[PDB]
Amino acid sequence: MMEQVCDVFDIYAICACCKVESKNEGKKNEVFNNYTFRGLGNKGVLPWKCISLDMKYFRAVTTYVNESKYEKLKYKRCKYLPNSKKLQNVVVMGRTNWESIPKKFKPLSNRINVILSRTLKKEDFDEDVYIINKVEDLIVLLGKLNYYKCFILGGSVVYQEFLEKKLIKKIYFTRINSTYECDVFFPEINENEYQIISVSDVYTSNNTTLDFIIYKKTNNK
Amino acid sequence: MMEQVCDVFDIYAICACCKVESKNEGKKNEVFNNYTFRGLGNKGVLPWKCISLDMKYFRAVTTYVNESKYEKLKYKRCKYLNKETKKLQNVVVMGRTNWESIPKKFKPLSNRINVILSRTLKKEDFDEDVYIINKVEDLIVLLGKLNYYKCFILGGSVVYQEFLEKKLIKKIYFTRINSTYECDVFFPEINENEYQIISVSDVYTSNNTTLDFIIYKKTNN
Amino acid sequence: DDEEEDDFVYFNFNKEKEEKNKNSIHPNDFQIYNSLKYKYHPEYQYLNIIYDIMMNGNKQSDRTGVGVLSKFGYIMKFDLSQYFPLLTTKKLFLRGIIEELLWFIRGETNGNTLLNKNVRIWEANGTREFLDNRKLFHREVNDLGPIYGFQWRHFGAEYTNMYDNYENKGVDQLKNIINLIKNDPTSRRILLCAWNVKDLDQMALPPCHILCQFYVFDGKLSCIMYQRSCDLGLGVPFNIASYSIFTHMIAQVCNLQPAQFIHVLGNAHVYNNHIDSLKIQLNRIPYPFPTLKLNPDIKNIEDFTISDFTIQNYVHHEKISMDMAA
Amino acid sequence: DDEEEDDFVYFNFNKEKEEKNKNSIHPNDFQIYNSLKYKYHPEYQYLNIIYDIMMNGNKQSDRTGVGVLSKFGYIMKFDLSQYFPLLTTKKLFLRGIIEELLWFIRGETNGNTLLNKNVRIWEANGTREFLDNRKLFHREVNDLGPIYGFQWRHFGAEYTNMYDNYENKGVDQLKNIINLIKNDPTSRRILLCAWNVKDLDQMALPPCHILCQFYVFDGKLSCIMYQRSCDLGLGVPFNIASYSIFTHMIAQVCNLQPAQFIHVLGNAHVYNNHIDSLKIQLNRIPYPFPTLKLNPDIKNIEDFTISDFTIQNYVHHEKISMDMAA
Ligand SMILES: NC(=O)C1=CN([C@@H]2O[C@H](COP(=O)(O)OP(=O)(O)OC[C@H]3O[C@@H](n4cnc5c(N)ncnc54)[C@H](OP(=O)(O)O)[C@@H]3O)[C@@H](O)[C@H]2O)C=CC1
Ligand SMILES: NC(=O)C1=CN([C@@H]2O[C@H](COP(=O)(O)OP(=O)(O)OC[C@H]3O[C@@H](n4cnc5c(N)ncnc54)[C@H](OP(=O)(O)O)[C@@H]3O)[C@@H](O)[C@H]2O)C=CC1
Ligand SMILES: CC1(C)N=C(N)N=C(N)N1OCCCOc1cc(Cl)c(Cl)cc1Cl
Ligand SMILES: CC1(C)N=C(N)N=C(N)N1OCCCOc1cc(Cl)c(Cl)cc1Cl
Ligand SMILES: O=c1ccn([C@H]2C[C@H](O)[C@@H](COP(=O)(O)O)O2)c(=O)[nH]1
Ligand SMILES: O=c1ccn([C@H]2C[C@H](O)[C@@H](COP(=O)(O)O)O2)c(=O)[nH]1
């Protein structure tokens, strides 16, 4: 079992975290660390109104594919283990998160949408929009499909388990440099297991600055 | 349609040319062009005393090989020949006069497979580990039998002239020596329709003269 | 078409064999810094210069005796429309540099004005011993001479003492560049210069920020500041912030939006005693930058007060004392 | 590792489209220029800036009425130990700029001295009409005022007329920098400044080469020159040459070897009437650079004469008349 799933099925996580109100019960003078950016959502929605730049990024990363690199990945998956004229990525999201998305954007265009739910039923749905009972079934659905990469879009429960069961190869983390109130957060990334390998330029979008960083799984056991 | 010899066997020319000492016509308003650099030799040896930086570049280029890229060059040569599928080295070709101008201590050229063109001399006339060929067609036959990375034609003028005429040169690694010397042999005038400059290096000073390195590539015409 | 891949190797035939060790630097000294693949955050423009000097700098002595590693000529550019470039790999405070800037604008040369507000940036430069070393024996303590402020508002006026009245004396460069920016925006002569050759010896010390040049296009203002001597470890972080704040001030009073702050470094150096502290800093990963907000009510360069400035969302690593003896 | 390759693509998610590029440039206008794979010749630092301005410059009007395409802030570096950077993509002659440089060193402000050597660089700036336009009604024709030379040898002296004796008046910056380079080489205050704010209006025209700062290491001399306004098509080629020659002269009189000439450009512009000529020049491939030889017996900055300079092996493309109307 030294053939890791995430490296075979290239399972990635992409999120955006803001800063969270100190609850008014913090001490004297503040300290910062990567955990400072952990706010994920508030009452079923995103903590902030709308940050178009992060939207544009998320879309670009989840819908980008390089066909001249697929065969090599095909070659990798089968060995391990016409339909669609265009190759695509698989986006795994939880029901809550699925419900949060608006109407005109579902299912996410140019993407193979998947949903984790123990309650939903495949039928009143599109034959084109898969669904699964548990994380383990996903690996099976991936085994059948022809896809470039698989992106775990949240939410929190989703992130926690996928991180727990260690199915994440990289984390495309957006650091939103502003405070909002949240009720759901992102897990505290362990440094011994994930390390930042890339940091982008800094931008301003909808009255807040933000940057994009990338965490990569550490090969140290 | 089908392959050109210089592409299958990767045959390149490498040379160094200075400005030629013409001495009395109307030099304060002389005209310059690529042909300005064309001096190759004098009395059987180089026009200049010694320009170490060019010797260093020459050695670096003619001895460099990339083993990981060889497995592919091999496939290409075999296929072209319809044949099936020690330390790797480049092949260097030189005319008899050129070979004779090289000091004993440098022959045969280190880490390279040496090949000499001659009709007047035969293998019995050489004590060195060198291949003697009496026809250009024989180089191709030889290249078809050896395991080598790239093939560099080293001059002299008689040799440069026939390889360009037979169109067996894929690229020309040309050093422009920016100074004047007495010469008796010249590099052939390059046709701009057949070859175009694709790269020019930084400018340097070596042994009291400035010089640069340019690369001509065979064209799509 | 990897053809041209080997060509790239050829052009590098005369490269230096770094297998040769220089400036007594240990590989792992910059383990984390060198572990990142893409370092696009703007703070790396500052961090990469420090790394370059540490790895390739020239060992030299200097006026202070501490000695340094130095290089000559660099340029950094910060996009003020996207962030406020306050370094995040160490903690930085701004009250003091903002008061220094307001003091420059008032045209002052009295060091006591800063000391009474607990801003000690110029304290050492105004001591009896420091002035006597500069041979300014007849200069009162903290009377800095015709430095920045005096040149910005009275270039060319004869300096007497810090309490004299210089109203309308000399060239009011600050007033002039504001008028040029408002009325002749495409002028290529919009410069503010502190390097008055005639007055250098009367100054507690010759200026480091020689000049500021401005450029206006499509309602946006950019500024280039040329710094002749740059203490990378301690001075530069504050210099970037001061001039970025100044650019916002000028832009605002001229009804323009700030665009780029361009910093040109002349003698760029790392003091021998800051080396350990900088090795630590370079291995820290930048956080997104904060933003700077100015009270929009201020319409004239002379009306800004300390409460008119606000830095928001400043996320930073812990402070670092650059001094080995610190 | 090819995964970092997809990451590279993500970082470019917000990059500009193609038809967002701001100017009217036809694809084939730079066909040869864009055909080259590796453009490492140092002349490309110059050619690349012109290209950057043509493709991304800002259209703006200017004091001359011709209008330009401009950008703000660039830096070029030339290694004088390896070559003399005299542009080869067009023919340049240096007699006049060298006479100009000797005229500056002598501290002269008399335009007739240059006209008498048939050097017309300053002719237009000294006519009756030009001076009256600057409101210099009481200035004799060709009396340029306190320009470069005057500032280099007498900064701060009161200017009267071009024939006056200014011995021992003002600050002799030139002698001062030579002394600092010889006796305090690690000083970070070795600067020569021409921008005397108080004398600007008395000059036939304000200076473009604002200052020069020197750097000395291991017996080698480097020089940074800050140019506030740069005419890329006509002025810059000669400016690079002038300061490269000046660096060689200063180095020689101080028993040092020249190292780098670093050119900082503030408002860099390409005049609208030079666009056609530059499109042509950019498609020409540079030749290896010439070398500059100075008579070795000259040991003092003031002893050079025109015959002490020789440019050797200058290979170049045909002369170009930058002006569209020319
Ligand atoms: N900042 C960011 O980048 C993102 C923020 N968010 C925010 O977070 C919020 C949602 O967060 P959170 O409450 O954590 O929930 P999620 O949205 O992650 O997931 C909830 C759903 O996951 C399903 N689920 C959970 N575990 C499993 C499992 N093991 N197998 C199968 N299905 C499973 C549930 O199905 P059911 O109950 O039917 O059984 C449930 O409806 C929103 O406010 C959203 O806007 C969301 C994505 C990204
Ligand atoms: N500047 C530079 O980069 C270089 C300069 N040189 C200079 O050029 C000079 C040599 O020039 P050059 O006189 O033209 O001679 P070459 O070095 O080109 O030798 C030509 C001779 O080599 C043999 N030869 C050539 N073609 C063939 C063929 N097709 N079949 C069989 N034999 C062949 C013959 O040898 P034989 O008569 O025995 O039969 C012929 O006489 C020297 O001065 C040398 O220093 C040389 C290389 C590079
Ligand atoms: C947070 C967001 C986008 N950004 C990053 N980097 N990472 C994510 N996992 N993203 O969200 C995916 C799930 C929510 O998608 C949407 C939610 C809303 Cl509310 C709207 Cl309007 C449109 C969309 Cl597509
Ligand atoms: C000119 C030289 C080297 N440089 C380039 N770029 N291209 C060449 N084809 N070169 O010559 C190769 C054949 C001659 O080699 C030598 C000739 C002499 Cl005379 C001496 Cl002393 C030593 C040597 Cl190795
Ligand atoms: O705003 C400032 C003022 C000073 N310095 C540094 C540069 C030098 O290390 C020292 C001044 O010394 P000299 O360059 O004048 O010798 O202070 C800065 O970096 N920024
Ligand atoms: O040595 C020189 C002198 C002048 N100029 C150019 C720059 C401007 O195009 C014009 C001077 O005009 P103003 O910048 O002063 O407006 O001359 C140069 O490039 N180099």
D220 touches chain C (CB under 8 A): no
Antiparallel, parallel or unpaired: β B195-200 and D38-39: parallel
Q: Yes or no: say if C296 and C309 are a contact pair by the CB < 8 Å rule.
A: no
For chain D, the first-to-last Cα distance in angstroms comes to: 56
Antiparallel, parallel or unpaired: β C38-39 and A194-199: parallel
Q: Yes or no: say if A195 and C35 are a contact pair by the CB < 8 Å rule.
A: yes
Q: Yes or no: say if B218 and B6 are a contact pair by the CB < 8 Å rule.
A: yes
- Indicate the helix (H) or strand (E) that contains D271: strand D257-271
Query: Nominal resolution in Å?
Result: 2.1
| Residues β-bridged to residue D225 | D212, D263
- Indicate the helix (H) or strand (E) that contains D8: helix D3-11
Cα B80 from Cα B71, distance rounded (Å): 15
Q: Which of A173, A197, A199, A208 has the highest number of chain C CBs within 10 A, making it the mutation to test binding with C?
A: A199
**Number of structural domains, chain D?**
1
Antiparallel, parallel or unpaired: β C257-271 and A147-152: unpaired
- Indicate the helix (H) or strand (E) that contains D97: helix D95-105
Angle between helix axes D235-253 and D95-105 (nearest 10 degrees) is: 50
Closest CA to C192 of D195, D266, D71: D195
Cα D9 from Cα A66, distance rounded (Å): 10
Contacts of D207 (CB under 8 A, 6+ apart): D147, D148, D151, D194, D195
Output the 3-class SS for chain C: CCHHHHHHHHHCCCCCCCCCCCCCCCHHHHHHHHHCCEECCCHHHHHHHHHHHHHHCEEECCCCCCCEEEEEEEEEEEECCCCCCCCCCCCCCCHHHHHHHHHHHCCCCEHHHHHCCCCCCCCHHHCHHHHHHCCCCCCCCCECCCCHHHHHHHECCCCCCCCCCCCCCCECHHHHHHHHHHHCCCCCCCEEECCCHHHHHHCCCCCCEEEEEEEEECCEEEEEEEEEEEECCCHHHHHHHHHHHHHHHHHHHCCCEEEEEEEEEEEEEEEHHHHHHHHHHHCCCCCCCCEEEECCCCCCHHHCCHHHEEEECCCCCCCCCCCCCC
**How many whole angstroms from C229 Cα to the centroid of ligand 5?**
5
Would you say the CB of residue B10 lies under 6 angstroms from ligand 4? Answer: no
3-state secondary structure of D22: coil
Q: Output the CA–CA distances (angstroms, integers) from residue A172 to A60, A199, A221, B96, C33, in the order listed.
A: 12, 10, 22, 63, 20
Q: Output the CA–CA distances (angstroms, integers) from residue D211 to C107, C265, D228, in the order listed.
A: 24, 14, 10
- Is the alpha carbon torsion for C248, C254, C256, C261 positive or negative? negative
Q: Which of C2, C7, C9 sits opposite B215 (nearest CB)?
A: C7
Buried b / exposed e along A75-84 (16+ C-beta atoms within 10 A): eebeeeeeee
Cα D80 from Cα D89, distance rounded (Å): 19
Å between A23 CA and nearest CA of chain C: 17
Q: Yes or no: say if D185 and D169 are a contact pair by the CB < 8 Å rule.
A: no
- Indicate the helix (H) or strand (E) that contains D5: helix D3-11
- Indicate the helix (H) or strand (E) that contains D270: strand D257-271
**Domain that residue C309 falls in:** 1-326
Cα C54 from Cα C234, distance rounded (Å): 15
Catalytic residue among C208, C212, C223, C254: C208
Amino acid (1-letter code) at residue C124: A
**How many whole angstroms from C46 Cα to the centroid of ligand 5?**
17
Residues in chain C: 326
Cα D154 from Cα D150, distance rounded (Å): 5
| Residues β-bridged to residue C171 | C155
Amino acid (1-letter code) at residue D220: K
Cβ D83–B203 below 8 Å, yes or no? yes
Q: At C178, which CATH number?
A: 3.30.572.10
Q: Calculate the dihedral angle through the C-alpha atoms of D305, D310, D314, D316, rounding to the nearest 10 degrees.
A: 10
Contacts of D292 (CB under 8 A, 6+ apart): D84, D244, D245, D248, D309, D310, D311, D312
Cα A42 from Cα A37, distance rounded (Å): 15
Q: Which residues on D lie below 8 Å from A56 (Cβ)?
A: 13-14
Cα C82 from Cα C220, distance rounded (Å): 13
**How many whole angstroms from B55 Cα to the centroid of ligand 4?**
7
Cα C2 from Cα D146, distance rounded (Å): 59
- For a pocket test of ligand 6, which of D101, D212, D231, D239 has the largest count of ligand atoms closer than 8 A to its C-beta? D231
Here the tokens at position A69 are 């690199």
A19: Cα within 13 Å, side-chain hemisphere: 21
- Ligand (nearest to CA of A107): 3
Q: Yes or no: say if C111 and C164 are a contact pair by the CB < 8 Å rule.
A: no
Cβ D40–B200 below 8 Å, yes or no? yes
Experimental method: X-ray
Chain centroid, CA C33 distance in Å: 24
Atom of ligand 6 nearest to the CA of D64: 16
Buried b / exposed e along C150-162 (16+ C-beta atoms within 10 A): bbbbbbbbebeeb
Q: Phi and psi of D253, rounded to 5°?
A: -70, -10
Chain centroid, CA A167 distance in Å: 12
Q: List the C257-271 sheet strands across, edge first.
A: C58-60, C68-79, C257-271, C220-231, C209-217, C191-193
Closest CA to C134 of C199, C221, C60, C210: C199
Q: Which domains does chain A have, with CATH numbers?
A: 1-221 (3.40.430.10)
**DSSP category for residue D110:** B
Q: Which chain C residue's Cα is nearest to B201?
A: C11
Here the tokens at position C236 are 């530069």
Angle between helix axes C275-282 and C43-56 (nearest 10 degrees) is: 130
Cα A33 from Cα A30, distance rounded (Å): 10
- Indicate the helix (H) or strand (E) that contains B180: strand B171-181
Cα B88 from Cα B146, distance rounded (Å): 10
Q: Which residues on B lie below 8 Å from C6 (Cβ)?
A: 64, 66
Closest CA to B144 of B96, B94, B72, B82: B82
Q: Yes or no: say if C245 and C293 are a contact pair by the CB < 8 Å rule.
A: no
Strand segments, DSSP code E, in chain A are 11-20, 37-41, 88-94, 111-116, 147-152, 170-180, 184-185, 194-199, 203-204, 209-217
Atom of ligand 1 nearest to the CA of A46: 45
Closest CA to B168 of B156, B152, B157: B152
Cβ A66–D6 below 8 Å, yes or no? yes
Here the tokens at position A212 are 């994009």
- Indicate the helix (H) or strand (E) that contains A136: helix A135-144
- Is the alpha carbon torsion for D64, D66, D67, D69 positive or negative? negative
**How many whole angstroms from C320 Cα to the centroid of ligand 5?**
19
Cα A207 from Cα C313, distance rounded (Å): 11
Contacts of D286 (CB under 8 A, 6+ apart): B200, D41, D43, D44, D47, D88, D89
